[PDB]
């Protein structure tokens, strides 16, 4: 829980910074679901949406950044603002199938 | 024909064995890719073994690509006698078990 969020948090964040990232299979897939809907509000655009997405990622630089920055680029589609793509390698000791995901561009 | 062998290897006789059992009586290249993207440890170690084997092979035992593995086997050896907690009384060791790595490279 506290954690599920936590993650969705740091990740959603750095993610917007980069447009893509490396996590593991699932990690990616849901980071997708949500960073995604965040994106959707980014679209919504306004006092309110802004409010929410910040409500979670917490910080202007990016908040608006996403919002005014790319929201545009995407304002048009129907979700899918994210594209998760399976990776070819596994983190050691471990054996875990990491993946790379991005905002579709 | 020529081969690949390394003692004082620090690894799972067994697991090691599955590694080889699988890249097995098969194509050099091919199995090579096998150690390449295959999981678990050793994979590496083994692929190394191969490398040295075929190098050894056309360099001074000689027709590169017609080579494959003609047999492969690992043999456990000197142990690593590990001293762990006393029976909160009498020590209890566990032996890392050094492993012997051997593989055959032979042309077609």
């Amino acid at each position: 829980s506290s954690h599920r969020l936590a993650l969705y948090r740091n990740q959603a964040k750095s993610l917007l910074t980069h447009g893509r990232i490396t996590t593991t299979v699932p990690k990616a897939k849901e980071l997708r679901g949500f960073v995604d809907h965040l994106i959707h509000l980014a679209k919504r655009g306004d006092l309110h949406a802004r409010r929410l997405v910040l409500r979670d990622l917490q910080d202007v630089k990016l908040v608006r950044k996403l919002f005014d920055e790319i929201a545009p680029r995407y304002r048009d589609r129907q979700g899918g603002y994210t594209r998760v793509l399976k990776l070819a390698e596994r983190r050691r000791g471990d054996g875990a199938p990491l993946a790379l995901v991005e905002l579709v561009e | 024909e020529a081969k690949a062998i390394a003692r004082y290897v620090r690894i799972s006789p067994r697991k090691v064995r599955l590694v080889v059992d699988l890249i097995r009586g098969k194509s050099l290249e091919e199995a090579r890719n096998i150690l390449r993207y295959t999981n678990k440890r050793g994979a590496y170690f083994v692929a190394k073994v191969l490398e040295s084997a075929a190098a050894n092979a056309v360099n001074n035992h000689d027709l590169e690509d017609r080579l494959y593995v003609k047999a492969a086997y690992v043999d456990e050896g000197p142990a690593l006698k590990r001293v762990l907690p006393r029976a909160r009384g009498r020590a209890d060791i566990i032996k890392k078990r050094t492993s012997h790595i051997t593989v055959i490279l032979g042309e077609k």
Partner: protein, 58 residues
């Protein structure tokens, strides 16, 4: 507190069978997209970067 710990040695033989059911199977792999080499079915590689998109390096 070892209520039950094996009662008999285990039979070399059988023991091994037990182990037996256990089988190794090299990753299915498929040849590249065009970076021409063999690859982990479905993925870019230190050969590739493609798929349909140039994401990767070297």
């Amino acid at each position: 507190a070892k209520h039950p710990v094996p009662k008999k040695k285990t039979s070399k033989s059988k023991r091994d069978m037990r182990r037996s059911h256990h089988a190794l199977t090299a990753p299915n792999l498929t040849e590249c997209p065009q970076c021409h080499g063999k690859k982990l079915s479905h993925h870019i590689c230190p050969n590739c970067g493609y798929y349909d998109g140039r994401q990767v390096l070297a």
